[PDB]
Amino acid sequence: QTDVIAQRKAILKQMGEATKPIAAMLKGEAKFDQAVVQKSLAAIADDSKKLPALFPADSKTGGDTAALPKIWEDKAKFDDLFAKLAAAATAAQGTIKDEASLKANIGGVLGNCKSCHDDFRAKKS
Numbered sequence: 001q002t003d004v005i006a007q008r009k010a011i012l013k014q015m016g017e018a019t020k021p022i023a024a025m026l027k028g029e030a031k032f033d034q035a036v037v038q039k040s041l042a043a044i045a046d047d048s049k050k051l052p053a054l055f056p057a058d059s060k061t062g063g064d065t066a067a068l069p070k071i072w073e074d075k076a077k078f079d080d081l082f083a084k085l086a087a088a089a090t091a092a093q094g095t096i097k098d099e100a101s102l103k104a105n106i107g108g109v110l111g112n113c114k115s116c117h118d119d120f121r122a123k124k125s
């Protein structure tokens with residue numbers, strides 16, 4: 001075993017950082033950059049494939065984790081959500097060509113973050 005919780009929180013933090021450039025663009029605070037968008041989408045898709053291996057049943061009582069017990073009661077659903085994110089991100093990479101398509105396609109990707117957090121992450125801090 002190892003400190004899997006530190007592992008996952010780090011990768012998940014990277015996903016949040018990855019969405020920043022995109023949110024800046026939506027908020028009109030940054031000029032649309034296709035290279036930056038694709039870089040963030042690729043990062044998100046790659047991390048989504050690494051995360052399914054980082055949620056072992058013995059990592060629910062750390063004291064510094066926001067992962068809810070339900071993850072282990074609905075593990076098939078939880079894993080698939082990461083799969084849905086990866087698939088959505090990879091698809092987005094191919095459909096997002098300009099600012100108009102970013103605004104139009106980014107929701108399907110980012111909607112996954114909320115879907116999981118609603119059921120599997122503790123509201124707090």
Ligand code: HEM
Binds near residue numbers: 008066085109
């Ligand atoms: C999707 C684009 C997405 C983002 C963005 C995202 C971010 C995120 C952050 C920033 C955290 C906190 C990490 C930290 O402590 O620094 C976090 C935490 C959890 N998430 Fe999330 N998340 C995104 C997607 C998903 C998906 C698709 C799921 C589940 C299928 C998911 C789950 C979780 C869980 C659970 C945590 C808590 C981790 C822990 O404390 O052990 N996220 N997310």
